[PDB]
């Protein structure tokens, strides 16, 4: 039936997800429990460990808070490219209006970054540089303001979100559902977007049944978190309004500028 077309969708999306993103939640969780036979991540808990850790972290090439925040930017910019490549794999996404493609990504990417960033997070800290590093939550709190407050809400959201014990195959459709948001400010031709999202939501529903109990209630939980996201995305962009003025010295990445342009 059409219940077969939905498993095809979920499996096509999952394959795009594996290929588009370097590190799956599967591996990320393995690393975070030491359970992996792979080498341990260099643990960063203070400036000393950061300065010793420059070795095992994808380099950049002057203040530690600003240097750490500068690390997030390059990671975010790589994520936007991985997310943009994945969106292109969502059946009918590239057939949409190229202005609507830009709009869906503009608003979608930070919500998906935070969804996927939870995969790398526990209460104690965050896997960075594709699992080669582990930056502690306490250390990130210890940064001078406004940089101290930069990643706490992401930690807060991740501990709630990780509750739902979703898998990669759940996350592939979920993030596809987040991109295909009909209600994004500035969208020209909504109904084609809203059509696709209905398809993805059916596939998400089916996927969640075949993998979890209290499915409608999980599926329900998972669609309210989808607004917990827009919250922390709004909160995040205000903190960057703060940082753009209060820290005139440090510059923002041109791609991160294209996105935050007229955002909330």
């Amino acid at each position: 039936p059409e219940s077969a077309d939905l498993r095809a969708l979920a499996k096509h999306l999952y394959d795009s997800y594996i290929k588009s993103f370097p590190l799956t939640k599967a591996k990320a969780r393995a690393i975070l429990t030491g359970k992996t036979t792979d080498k341990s991540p260099f643990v960063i808990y203070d400036m000393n460990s950061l300065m010793m850790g420059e070795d095992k972290i994808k380099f950049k090439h002057k203040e530690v808070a600003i240097r750490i925040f500068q690390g997030c930017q390059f990671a975010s910019v790589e994520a936007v490219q991985e997310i943009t490549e994945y969106a292109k794999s969502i059946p009918g996404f590239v057939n949409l209006d190229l202005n609507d493609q830009v709009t869906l990504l503009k608003y979608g990417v930070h919500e998906i970054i935070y969804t996927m960033l939870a995969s790398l997070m526990n209460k104690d800290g965050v896997l960075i540089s594709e699992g080669q590093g582990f930056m502690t939550r306490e250390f990130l709190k210890s940064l001078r303001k406004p940089f101290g407050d930069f990643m706490e809400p992401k930690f807060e959201f991740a501990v709630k979100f990780n509750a739902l014990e979703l898998d990669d195959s759940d996350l592939a459709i979920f993030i596809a559902v987040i991109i295909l948001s009909g209600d994004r400010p500035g969208l020209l031709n909504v109904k084609p977007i809203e059509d696709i999202q209905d398809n993805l939501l059916q596939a998400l529903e089916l996927q969640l049944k075949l993998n979890h109990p209290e499915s409608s209630q999980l599926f329900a939980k998972l669609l309210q978190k989808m607004t917990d996201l827009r919250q922390i995305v709004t909160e995040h962009v205000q903190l960057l309004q703060v940082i753009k003025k209060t820290e005139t010295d440090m510059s923002l990445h041109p791609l991160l500028q294209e996105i935050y342009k007229d955002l909330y």
Partner: peptide, 11 residues
């Protein structure tokens, strides 16, 4: 406006 986004999409 949105030059790099356009580039990455049409890429």
């Amino acid at each position: 406006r949105h030059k790099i986004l356009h580039r990455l999409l049409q890429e």
